[PDB]
Amino acid sequence: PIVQMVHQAISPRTLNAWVKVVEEKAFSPEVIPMFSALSEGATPQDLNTMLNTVGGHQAAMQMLKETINEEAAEWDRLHPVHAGPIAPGQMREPRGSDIAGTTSTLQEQIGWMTHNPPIPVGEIYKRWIILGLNKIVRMYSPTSILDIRQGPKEPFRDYVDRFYKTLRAEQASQEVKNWMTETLLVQNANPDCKTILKALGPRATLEEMMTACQGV
Amino acid sequence: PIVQMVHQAISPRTLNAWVKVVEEKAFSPEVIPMFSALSEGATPQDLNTMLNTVGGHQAAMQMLKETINEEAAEWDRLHPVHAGPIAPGQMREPRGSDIAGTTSTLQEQIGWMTHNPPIPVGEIYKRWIILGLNKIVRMYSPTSILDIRQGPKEPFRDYVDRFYKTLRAEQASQEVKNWMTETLLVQNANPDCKTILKALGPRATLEEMMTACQGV
Amino acid sequence: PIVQMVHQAISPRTLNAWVKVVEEKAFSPEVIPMFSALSEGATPQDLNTMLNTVGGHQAAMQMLKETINEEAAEWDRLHPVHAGPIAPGQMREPRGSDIAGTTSTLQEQIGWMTHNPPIPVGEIYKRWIILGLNKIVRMYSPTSILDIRQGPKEPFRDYVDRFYKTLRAEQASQEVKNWMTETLLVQNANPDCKTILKALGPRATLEEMMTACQGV
Amino acid sequence: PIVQMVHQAISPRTLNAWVKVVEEKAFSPEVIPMFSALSEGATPQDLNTMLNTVGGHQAAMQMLKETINEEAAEWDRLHPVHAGPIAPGQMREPRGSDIAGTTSTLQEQIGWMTHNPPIPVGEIYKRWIILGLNKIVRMYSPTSILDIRQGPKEPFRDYVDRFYKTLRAEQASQEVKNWMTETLLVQNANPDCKTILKALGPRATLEEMMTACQGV
Amino acid sequence: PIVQMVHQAISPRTLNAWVKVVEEKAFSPEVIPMFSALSEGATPQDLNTMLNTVGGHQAAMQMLKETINEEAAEWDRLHPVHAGPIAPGQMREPRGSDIAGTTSTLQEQIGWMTHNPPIPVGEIYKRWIILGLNKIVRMYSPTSILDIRQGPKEPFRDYVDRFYKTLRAEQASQEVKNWMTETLLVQNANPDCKTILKALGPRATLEEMMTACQGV
Amino acid sequence: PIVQMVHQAISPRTLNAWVKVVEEKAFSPEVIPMFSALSEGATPQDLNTMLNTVGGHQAAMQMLKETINEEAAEWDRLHPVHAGPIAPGQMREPRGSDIAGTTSTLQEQIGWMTHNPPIPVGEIYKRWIILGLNKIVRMYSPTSILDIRQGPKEPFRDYVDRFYKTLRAEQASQEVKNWMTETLLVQNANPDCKTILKALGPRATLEEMMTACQGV
């Protein structure tokens, strides 16, 4: 990785942490913030190490590769590399494959990340990887938020847990997700608790809603 | 985080510690001092990492988000950002969303935390998060301090353990909590030990009270 | 903590070590030297973190708080804070609550600990905490040193183990404890071994005593 | 290893990580990216330590030695060492055996890796080792990609997992591997899902293919 | 401890290592080299921490205290402290109790250990502690080297293992121990192997002796 | 140890690693490369710590001591220490016992290892120790390479694993070992696979041999 800026190899306990999360949690939504945290300051080499050390889930990993390739192609379309001898004082322009670590060396990565102004190829590539992981997570979610409905004897807290767990894995903007919160959560509550929530009125907070249906 | 002041990514063993505490203890009161200790010097990015890596308890986590949003809105009301080009020597004013790490970069956070005088957005955001966790803890407590009563054969030490465990999760100021100590603890003691505590008089220390009812 | 002098957050493995000791050993006497070792160089914030992260034993923890409050009050009586504007070059006088970390910031603590001459508020507060833990340990000891008597078939080494274990938890000065060693250990030995120890004479070392009763 | 450039002995937790991976996973394909990650910045001494600390799999390890010897011989053929006294300011040319760490000292390795321009003998040797590990991995794979066929009731995601797992261990260029993807994956799908994939057309992405056969 | 020379608190994993060794191995001879290794560079405070964190074995620990007190008294007899005001540039002379960490501060220890020429109170105290541990080890050994005799069907390697294990815990100089090796090992061998060892002659090495009795 | 060159105590996790390897693997051949890796940069004190912390295998450990003593004696014969006052600017010549850490201090070791030109007593002593461990390993091997013969139904890969495992523990030069490879491996193969290997011809690589007998 790179520490604040000096270069350092990815740590054995970072590597083990990532392998373990994937083995135990598959692509549960919290896997993505864990990936991002484990890869703070990471070069594209480090990111590839993390992705390559995953054993199994090879369908997912190959979908990830496809997403990265799509983003790399769009990068090249927006940022064409010009043919010409690079002058002594300078470094070259990164291609999609350079951002993904496939056609760049560590030194070239290091060069872009530390050169002023910074070309932050690790952060750009991590974005692409996260875009791919989001697709995988939505793939691994069996359920739609529209199907999260409160059970007849289900405590409201348990329903809310299921609701927001599902909502986390939905492909939707924050605007769409806000609409799902403000719409579906109350609509799909069970008859007894729903009646109580309506009497609170339409601008009550989640704390107040959860406390309201605690007795029932 | 930031070490005393140089920037450092949140550690794999810090991240694992937090995930584990939440899995094993849910929102027992001691979870909050653990959160605070694990997040010493933390940037808002680090704090969000910690909150985002929690799997399950999604009702709680969404209540936390609501509390943060309320505090962010109050920040903006008190501290309005002015429209204008930021001069070269300066950095901009943080909004609520900048404190919460949602609209700021690590570099902007770092800039505020290290610039003189310091704008300590990590410490401000940690406060908001703790305010949210307090609500969650009180939610997760099933019991009121008013219902902690000594059992007929319960050793006094066991009663005191239950009393202060419950008291820790109460929403009350230190003044209200002092009143609960000075009032309820003796009043809700069992008949035999209560008689003994009254004969000690009204300004005896907890050590003396606990020793007094050791034989009984 | 503070390393020799640069400031550093309390470590995840220090925090975990303390939590684990308390869970597994309660307030066995060796818990106190472990606390002291884990808190080397600690600021009052670090000490409070350690105390606050203990789950359960809330009667003990509240007794600890009482002892700290007593020591804080005595500090204020001996060292009154004077009302007045602190000049630019200086820092203010710590109150009892500043030593306990309740009314001070980390920076103020850091200021006192590093300023020349040093006001070592971490070491002062750790003393108060240890005074409180001693009371707890004596509370958790069921037994008095006067009741440690050698069994009819108990190997002398086993008796000596029980004797010094109990003696460790006694509230007594070193003079009182010396008297208990020189008096009770031989007096409460079993008839056969006691006869043998008297024939050694009255100034023989523990090694010699233990070897003398090895055959018997 | 070497940290960015200061020399450091290979760490106990790096060493243990490597031993453990090999014990648990044998030569599953992900073992190679793990080896590469654990050996970032490694000198030939470190690489030999890692290879020598593997217990069992001695047939594999001896095949690895053969591959290294072949690459060393080709190095010497391309880069002949010249007989002559090395002048004071300079260091000597590495032979195949110097790259493999067998006839060089740590200081000589260090000298080549840090001297300007760098002779990166650790990176060159790691390449040779990886070439050997690839042969071992292909040896340990029982199956050919041509024999990965979807079962009559096998969910498509499970078939894709088996397909890319097998493909990872194949000796084939990226061009050959692309042909296997674009050819075999669809051809060896089961009758029901194959019909559905053809109706998508011939330039649909893996995400779309996997979603298409989710119901079936 | 002190690192080469900057001061550092004793580490949580050092502390845990020591506690664990004692719990699991009691005072097996290898406990002493482990103690010495864990305490490299240790101040008397660190050494006391290690000794104080041992739970149980209180008879042993009290014998250790007696040995330390004896060595402290002999120190004072050889090195009397002179009464007088210590001049500004200087530090004072350590007493026995200062070496044992009982009447000195960390700063005083640090002062002696780092001042030129060094007064190495940590190394001196560690010696005294090891002297005490040796007595404990010999106490915990049930057996004398004179009673280690080869069994009728015991492989010679097993006899030699028992012999040197016992010999390690003996109180004897290297001269006495050499005599026990050169004398007892062959004399206490079983009839068949003893005959074979005599035919080797009297200056054969242990390797040769052990190989000689491998078939028998 | 010594880090590249600053002195550092041997780490708790290094110490634990060594103890564990010996407990679990005894003197399997891979124990020696592990010892060497764990002792990178080690002073003779560190090496002795490692050897002394081994519990059990005391016959082996005493054989190790004999080998070290033999090498020390040969050192003294080749390098006689001269009697005379060492001048201020200089340090003295190491004896055999100084290399083994028995008659030298850490400072003297440090002095030799860091003085220019370096007298690398840690590396010299580690050599002697490895010579001793080799003897132990050959002692612990029950089997001769001449007795490794392929079973009638044993897969060739399993035979090759046994062959090279045994070969690793043989006392033989690389020339003798090459002869054993080129001679015994094919000669001791089972009738069916042997016939197939001869038809490959006499200069085929191990990969090709192992693949040839995969079907059979």
Torsion of CA F4, F5, F8, F14, to 10 degrees: 40
Q: Give residues with Cβ within 8 angstroms of F96, minimum separation 6.
A: F69, F71, F72, F73, F74, F75, F76
Asked if the Cβ–Cβ distance from D33 to A53 is below 8 Å, we say: yes
**Main-chain phi, psi angles of D201, to 5 degrees:** 90, 175
**Two structure tokens written together for E11:** 């580490």
Measure D12 CA to nearest chain F CA, in Å: 6
| Chain pair D-F, CB pairs under 8 angstroms | 72
SS3 call for B213:
coil
Contact B148, B188 (CB under 8 A): yes
Measure A16 CA to nearest chain D CA, in Å: 8
Contact C126, C42 (CB under 8 A): yes
Asked if the Cβ–Cβ distance from A11 to B12 is below 8 Å, we say: yes
Q: What is the resolution of this structure in A?
A: 3.2
Contact B52, A30 (CB under 8 A): yes
In whole angstroms, give the CA distance from residue D149 to residue D194: 12
In whole angstroms, give the CA distance from residue A174 to residue B72: 17
In whole angstroms, give the CA distance from residue F139 to residue F62: 13
CA A7, A8, A10: angle at the middle one, nearest 5? 135
In whole angstroms, give the CA distance from residue B140 to residue B59: 11
Contact E35, E93 (CB under 8 A): no
Asked if the Cβ–Cβ distance from C165 to E6 is below 8 Å, we say: no
Q: What pairs with residue B3 in β-bridges?
A: B6
In whole angstroms, give the CA distance from residue A123 to residue A118: 11
In whole angstroms, give the CA distance from residue A198 to residue D111: 76
Q: Give residues with Cβ within 8 angstroms of E137, minimum separation 6.
A: E27, E28, E29, E31, E32, E169
In b/e form, how buried is each residue of F1-10, taking b as 16+ CB within 10 angstroms? bbeeeebebb
SS3 readout for chain E: CEECCEECCCCHHHHHHHHHHHHHHCCCCCHHHHHHHHCCCCCHHHHHHHHHCCCCCHHHHHHHHHHHHHHHHHHHHHCCCCCCCCCCCCCCCCCHHHHCCCCCCHHHHHHHHHCCCCCCHHHHHHHHHHHHHHHHHHHHCCCCHHHCCCCCCCCHHHHHHHHHHHHHCCCCCHHHHHHHHHHHHHHCCCHHHHHHHHHHCCCCCHHHHHHHCCCC
In whole angstroms, give the CA distance from residue E20 to residue A3: 35
Query: What residue of D is the nearest CA neighbor of A62?
Result: D164
Burial class of residue D8 in the structure, from the number of CB atoms within 10 Å of its CB (0-12 exposed, 13-18 middle, 19+ buried): middle
Please report all neighbours of B, defined by 3+ CB atom pairs within 8 A: A, C
Nearest to residue C33, comparing CAs of E10, D206, E106, E145?
A: E10
Torsion of CA D112, D117, D120, D124, to 10 degrees: -120
Residues of A in contact with B139 (CB under 8 A): 207, 210-211
- Work out the angle between the directed axes of helices A31-38 and A12-25 (0-180°, nearest 10): 170
Nearest to residue F30, comparing CAs of D10, D60, D57, D128?
A: D57
Asked if the Cβ–Cβ distance from C52 to B41 is below 8 Å, we say: no
**Two structure tokens written together for A25:** 């949690």
Question: How many other C-beta atoms can be found within 10 angstroms of the C-beta atom of residue C200?
Answer: 15
Contact C139, B155 (CB under 8 A): no
**Main-chain phi, psi angles of E212, to 5 degrees:** -55, -40
Residues of E in contact with C157 (CB under 8 A): 59
Which residues of chain B approach chain A closer than 8 Å at the C-beta?
Answer: 6-10, 12-13, 15-16, 48-49, 52-59, 61-63, 66-67, 70, 110, 135, 139
Contact F120, F113 (CB under 8 A): yes
Question: How many other C-beta atoms can be found within 10 angstroms of the C-beta atom of residue E142?
Answer: 9
How far, in Å, are A69, B82, D108, D126 from residue D97 at the CA level? 40, 68, 12, 13
Q: Give residues with Cβ within 8 angstroms of D33, minimum separation 6.
A: A48, A49, A52, A53
In whole angstroms, give the CA distance from residue E116 to residue C32: 35
* DSSP state letter for D155: -
Whether the bond between F191 and the residue before it is cis, its omega within 30 degrees of 0, is no
Burial class of residue E66 in the structure, from the number of CB atoms within 10 Å of its CB (0-12 exposed, 13-18 middle, 19+ buried): middle
**Main-chain phi, psi angles of C6, to 5 degrees:** -125, 140
Q: Are strands A6-7 and B2-3 parallel, antiparallel or unpaired?
A: unpaired
**Two structure tokens written together for B177:** 């909590």
Asked if the Cβ–Cβ distance from E66 to C206 is below 8 Å, we say: yes
Long-range CB contacts for residues C105-112, cutoff 8 Å, separation at least 24: C106/C7, C106/C43, C106/C45, C109/C43, C109/C44, C109/C45, C110/B4, C110/C2, C110/C7, C110/C43
CA B194, chain centre distance (Å): 33
Method of structure determination: X-ray
Question: How many other C-beta atoms can be found within 10 angstroms of the C-beta atom of residue E127?
Answer: 13
Contact F148, F162 (CB under 8 A): yes
Q: Roughly how many angstroms between the first and final C-alpha of chain D, as a whole number?
A: 52
Q: Are strands C6-7 and D2-3 parallel, antiparallel or unpaired?
A: unpaired
Nearest to residue F11, comparing CAs of F44, F61, F50?
A: F50
If you search the block for the tokens 């404990």, which residue do you land on?
E136
Asked if the Cβ–Cβ distance from F40 to D7 is below 8 Å, we say: no
Residues of D in contact with A14 (CB under 8 A): none
CA dihedral sign of residues E90, E94, E99, E103:
negative
Torsion of CA F59, F62, F63, F69, to 10 degrees: -170
In whole angstroms, give the CA distance from residue C9 to residue B178: 32
How far, in Å, are B160, B209, D174 from residue B199 at the CA level? 19, 10, 88
In whole angstroms, give the CA distance from residue C62 to residue B174: 14
Q: Give residues with Cβ within 8 angstroms of D166, minimum separation 6.
A: D141, D143, D144, D145, D148
| Chain pair B-C, CB pairs under 8 angstroms | 72
* DSSP state letter for F3: E
SS3 call for F2:
strand
Measure A161 CA to nearest chain D CA, in Å: 26
Residues of B in contact with A161 (CB under 8 A): 56-59
In whole angstroms, give the CA distance from residue F91 to residue B144: 76
Q: What pairs with residue B7 in β-bridges?
A: B2
> At B6, which helix (H) or strand (E)?
strand B6-7
Residues of E in contact with C168 (CB under 8 A): 58
Residues of F annotated as binding site? 13
In b/e form, how buried is each residue of C152-187, taking b as 16+ CB within 10 angstroms? eeeebeebbbbbbbbbbbbeeeeeeeeebbeebbee
| Chains D and A: 3 or more CB pairs within 8 Å of each other | yes
| Chains C and D: 3 or more CB pairs within 8 Å of each other | no
Q: Give residues with Cβ within 8 angstroms of D165, minimum separation 6.
A: A56, A58, D29
Long-range CB contacts for residues F140-148, cutoff 8 Å, separation at least 24: F140/F26, F140/F27, F140/F28, F140/F60, F140/F169, F141/F166, F141/F169, F141/F170, F144/F170, F145/F170, F145/F180, F145/F184, F146/F184, F148/F184, F148/F188
If you search the block for the tokens 């190790």, which residue do you land on?
F64
How far, in Å, are A52, C173, D48, E75 from residue E99 at the CA level? 56, 22, 46, 9
In whole angstroms, give the CA distance from residue B57 to residue B26: 8
Q: Point out the residue among F30, F206, F210 whose CB comes nearest to the CB of D52.
A: F30
- Helix ranges restricted to H, D53-190: 58-78, 96-99, 106-114, 121-140, 156-168, 174-187
Query: What residue of E is the nearest CA neighbor of F132?
Result: E207
CATH at residue F87: 1.10.375.10
Please report all neighbours of C, defined by 3+ CB atom pairs within 8 A: B, E
Interface probe for F, chosen from D20, D46, D63 (most Cβ of F below 10 Å), is D63
Q: Are strands A2-3 and B6-7 parallel, antiparallel or unpaired?
A: unpaired
| Chains A and F: 3 or more CB pairs within 8 Å of each other | no
How far, in Å, are B19, B20, B29 from residue B25 at the CA level? 10, 8, 9
Q: Which domain holds residue C71?
A: 2-140
**Main-chain phi, psi angles of A139, to 5 degrees:** -50, -40
CA atoms within a 13 Å half-sphere pointing along the CA-CB vector of D74: 9
Measure C179 CA to nearest chain E CA, in Å: 15
**Two structure tokens written together for C163:** 């004797």
In whole angstroms, give the CA distance from residue A180 to residue A146: 9
Q: Give residues with Cβ within 8 angstroms of A128, minimum separation 6.
A: A67, A68, A71, A72, A99, A100
Burial class of residue F138 in the structure, from the number of CB atoms within 10 Å of its CB (0-12 exposed, 13-18 middle, 19+ buried): middle
Asked if the Cβ–Cβ distance from A63 to D206 is below 8 Å, we say: yes
In whole angstroms, give the CA distance from residue E12 to residue C16: 10
Residues of B in contact with C39 (CB under 8 A): none
Long-range CB contacts for residues F15-19, cutoff 8 Å, separation at least 24: F15/E17, F15/E34, F15/E37, F15/E38, F15/F49, F15/F50, F15/F53, F16/E17, F17/D12, F17/D15, F17/D16, F18/F50, F18/F53, F18/F54, F19/F53, F19/F54, F19/F55
> At C175, which helix (H) or strand (E)?
helix C174-187
Measure A128 CA to nearest chain D CA, in Å: 15
In whole angstroms, give the CA distance from residue E199 to residue B189: 86
If you search the block for the tokens 């584990």, which residue do you land on?
B20
Q: Point out the residue among B6, B12, B70 whose CB comes nearest to the CB of A17.
A: B12
Question: How many other C-beta atoms can be found within 10 angstroms of the C-beta atom of residue A164?
Answer: 23
Q: Which amino acid is at F63?
A: M
Residues of B in contact with C135 (CB under 8 A): 207
Q: Point out the residue among B48, B61, B67 whose CB comes nearest to the CB of A164.
A: B61
In whole angstroms, give the CA distance from residue C121 to residue D97: 61
Asked if the Cβ–Cβ distance from B161 to C53 is below 8 Å, we say: no
If you search the block for the tokens 């003393």, which residue do you land on?
C127
Q: Which amino acid is at B211?
A: T
* DSSP state letter for B149: -
CA E105, E111, E114: angle at the middle one, nearest 5? 140
- Helix ranges restricted to H, chain F: 12-25, 31-38, 44-52, 58-78, 96-99, 106-114, 121-140, 156-168, 174-187, 191-200, 206-212
In whole angstroms, give the CA distance from residue B196 to residue B215: 11
CA atoms within a 13 Å half-sphere pointing along the CA-CB vector of B172: 16
Could you give the maximum distance between any two Cα atoms of chain B, in Å?
75
Q: Are strands C2-3 and C6-7 parallel, antiparallel or unpaired?
A: antiparallel
**Two structure tokens written together for F164:** 């090279």
SS3 call for F184:
helix
In b/e form, how buried is each residue of D71-92, taking b as 16+ CB within 10 angstroms? bbeebeeeeeeeeeeeeeeeee
Torsion of CA A10, A16, A21, A24, to 10 degrees: 160
Asked if the Cβ–Cβ distance from D30 to A16 is below 8 Å, we say: no
SS3 call for F6:
strand
In b/e form, how buried is each residue of B124-150, taking b as 16+ CB within 10 angstroms? bbbebbbebbbbbbbbbbeeebeebeb
In whole angstroms, give the CA distance from residue A67 to residue D146: 26
Asked if the Cβ–Cβ distance from E34 to F54 is below 8 Å, we say: no
Question: How many other C-beta atoms can be found within 10 angstroms of the C-beta atom of residue E215?
Answer: 7
In whole angstroms, give the CA distance from residue A77 to residue C127: 68
Contact F114, F5 (CB under 8 A): yes
In whole angstroms, give the CA distance from residue B65 to residue B100: 10
Q: What pairs with residue C3 in β-bridges?
A: C6
Contact E167, E177 (CB under 8 A): yes
Q: Is B13 assigned a ligand-binding role in the annotation?
A: yes
In whole angstroms, give the CA distance from residue A111 to residue A91: 7
SS3 call for B51:
helix
Measure B54 CA to nearest chain A CA, in Å: 7
If you search the block for the tokens 């590990």, which residue do you land on?
D133
Which residues of chain E approach chain C closer than 8 Å at the C-beta?
Answer: 6-10, 12-13, 15-16, 48-49, 52-59, 61-63, 66-67, 70, 110, 135, 139
Q: Give residues with Cβ within 8 angstroms of E24, minimum separation 6.
A: none
Burial class of residue E80 in the structure, from the number of CB atoms within 10 Å of its CB (0-12 exposed, 13-18 middle, 19+ buried): exposed
SS3 call for B5:
coil
Question: Residues in chain F, how many?
Answer: 216
Q: Point out the residue among F4, F28, F160 whose CB comes nearest to the CB of D7.
A: F4
Q: Give residues with Cβ within 8 angstroms of B157, minimum separation 6.
A: B210, B214, C59
Long-range CB contacts for residues D202-211, cutoff 8 Å, separation at least 24: D205/A66, D205/A70, D206/A59, D206/A62, D206/A63, D206/A66, D206/D160, D207/A63, D207/A66, D207/A67, D207/A135, D207/A139, D209/D156, D210/A59, D210/A63, D210/A139, D210/D156, D210/D157, D210/D160, D211/A139
In whole angstroms, give the CA distance from residue E211 to residue F63: 12
Give DSSP secondary structure letters for chain A: -EE--EE-PPPHHHHHHHHHHHHHHTT-TTHHHHHHHHTTT--HHHHHHHHHT--S-HHHHHHHHHHHHHHHHHHHHHSPPPPSPPPTT--PPPPHHHHTTSS--HHHHHHHHHSSS---HHHHHHHHHHHHHHHHHHHH----GGG----TT--HHHHHHHHHHHHHTS---HHHHHHHHHHHHHHTS-HHHHHHHHHH-SS--HHHHHHHTS--
Question: How many other C-beta atoms can be found within 10 angstroms of the C-beta atom of residue D213?
Answer: 22
